[PDB]
Design an enzyme around this catalytic site. Structure first.
Site, PDB file in Angstrom:
ATOM      1  N   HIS A  40      12.497 -22.148  48.614  1.00 61.15           N
ATOM      2  CA  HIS A  40      13.229 -22.230  49.878  1.00 61.15           C
ATOM      3  C   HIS A  40      14.683 -21.760  49.764  1.00 61.15           C
ATOM      4  O   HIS A  40      15.418 -21.734  50.748  1.00 61.15           O
ATOM      5  CB  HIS A  40      13.145 -23.644  50.506  1.00 61.15           C
ATOM      6  N   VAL A  57      37.127 -21.171  40.927  1.00 60.79           N
ATOM      7  CA  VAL A  57      38.172 -20.583  40.102  1.00 60.79           C
ATOM      8  C   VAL A  57      37.558 -19.884  38.906  1.00 60.79           C
ATOM      9  O   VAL A  57      36.633 -20.411  38.313  1.00 60.79           O
ATOM     10  CB  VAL A  57      39.129 -21.673  39.560  1.00 60.79           C
ATOM     11  N   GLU A  62      32.374 -17.414  32.426  1.00 61.05           N
ATOM     12  CA  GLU A  62      31.438 -17.063  33.485  1.00 61.05           C
ATOM     13  C   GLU A  62      30.838 -15.682  33.273  1.00 61.05           C
ATOM     14  O   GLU A  62      31.473 -14.794  32.712  1.00 61.05           O
ATOM     15  CB  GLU A  62      32.110 -17.070  34.867  1.00 61.05           C
ATOM     16  N   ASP A  84       7.127 -25.062  45.896  1.00 58.84           N
ATOM     17  CA  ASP A  84       8.513 -24.664  46.114  1.00 58.84           C
ATOM     18  C   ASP A  84       9.140 -24.239  44.789  1.00 58.84           C
ATOM     19  O   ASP A  84       9.871 -24.995  44.147  1.00 58.84           O
ATOM     20  CB  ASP A  84       9.290 -25.823  46.750  1.00 58.84           C
ATOM     21  N   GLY A 175      22.400 -28.369  48.726  1.00 56.69           N
ATOM     22  CA  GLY A 175      23.228 -27.574  47.835  1.00 56.69           C
ATOM     23  C   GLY A 175      22.792 -27.705  46.385  1.00 56.69           C
ATOM     24  O   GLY A 175      23.113 -26.853  45.553  1.00 56.69           O
ATOM     25  N   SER A 177      19.590 -28.031  45.730  1.00 56.49           N
ATOM     26  CA  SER A 177      18.280 -27.391  45.761  1.00 56.49           C
ATOM     27  C   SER A 177      18.133 -26.244  44.770  1.00 56.49           C
ATOM     28  O   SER A 177      19.041 -25.423  44.614  1.00 56.49           O
ATOM     29  CB  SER A 177      17.971 -26.885  47.174  1.00 56.49           C
ATOM     30  N   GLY A 178      16.976 -26.197  44.113  1.00 52.06           N
ATOM     31  CA  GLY A 178      16.703 -25.150  43.143  1.00 52.06           C
ATOM     32  C   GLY A 178      17.187 -25.489  41.748  1.00 52.06           C
ATOM     33  O   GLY A 178      16.801 -24.836  40.777  1.00 52.06           O
TER      34      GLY A 178
HETATM   35 CA   LIG Z   1      34.368 -20.640  37.662  1.00 52.84          CA
END
Ligand SMILES: [Ca+2]
Ligand SMILES: [Cl-]
Length: 223
Positions: A40, A57, A62, A84, A175, A177-178
């Site tokens: 979903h 930020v 990352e 799902d 939020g 979810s998954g």
């Molecule tokens: Ca970050």
């Protein structure tokens, strides 16, 4: 996550944020090039963000990678949320290190009472809306199928399980979810749905990953 705690930067290395100009769903890295999430959560233009803590930020560590293909389970039903689950292939392989690592798939299903870690950047309030900047964590037990079905009569399929607290106050939420539900170092669940968040007698419902291990492997092998 409602009623949880701040995980700590990069302490949940397999957690990913699905982004389309904003965070909309979580996911789990299962190998250098594949992410598992909820069906979903599907949409086009998904950018996978790895090694995140504060999602607003750039802090370092990352890795932003575009999704090259998203594979929603062919039997996913948007009305019942049965099946799902979705697989996302990264355009390029992620660079694995201590801050970005994959999580193992289960070899057997978890039993009621097993303690698990649920994490995400979802809403933190039951009676309101407030999204956190950093990753939140919650330790929650898998409930018996009996209590799960008593809580949601006629809505629990064999591909779902409940986890959480019947007294309310602690739960995953919009939020999240998954996102991952990890028990004993294995990915046993995917945040899927629930009635509201952290409400009494309404635990969170999760996609039962152990029923999809062969599907995941066969699908990844042919793509
Ligand atoms: Ca970050
Ligand atoms: Cl039933």
């Amino acid at each position: 996550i409602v009623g949880g705690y701040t995980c700590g930067a990069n302490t949940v290395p397999y957690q990913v944020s699905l982004n389309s100009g904003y965070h909309f769903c979580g996911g789990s890295l299962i190998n250098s090039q594949w992410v598992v999430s909820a069906a979903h959560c599907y949409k086009s233009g998904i950018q996978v963000r790895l090694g995140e803590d504060n999602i607003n930020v750039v802090e370092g560590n990352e890795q932003f990678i575009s999704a090259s293909k998203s594979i929603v389970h062919p039997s996913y039903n948007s009305n019942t949320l049965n099946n799902d689950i979705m697989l996302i292939k990264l355009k390029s392989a992620a660079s694995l290190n201590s801050r970005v690592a994959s999580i193992s798939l289960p070899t057997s299903c978890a039993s009621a009472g097993t303690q698990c870690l649920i994490s995400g950047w979802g809403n933190t309030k039951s009676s309101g809306t407030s999204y956190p900047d950093v990753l939140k964590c919650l330790k929650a037990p898998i409930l018996s199928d009996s209590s799960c079905k008593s809580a949601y009569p006629g809505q629990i399929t064999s591909n779902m399980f409940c986890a959480g607290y019947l007294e309310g106050g602690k739960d995953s939420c919009q939020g999240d979810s998954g996102g991952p539900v990890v028990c004993s170092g294995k990915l046993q669940g995917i945040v899927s749905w629930g009635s509201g968040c952290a409400q009494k007698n309404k635990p969170g419902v999760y996609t039962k990953v152990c029923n999809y291990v062969s599907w995941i492997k066969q699908t990844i092998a042919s793509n």
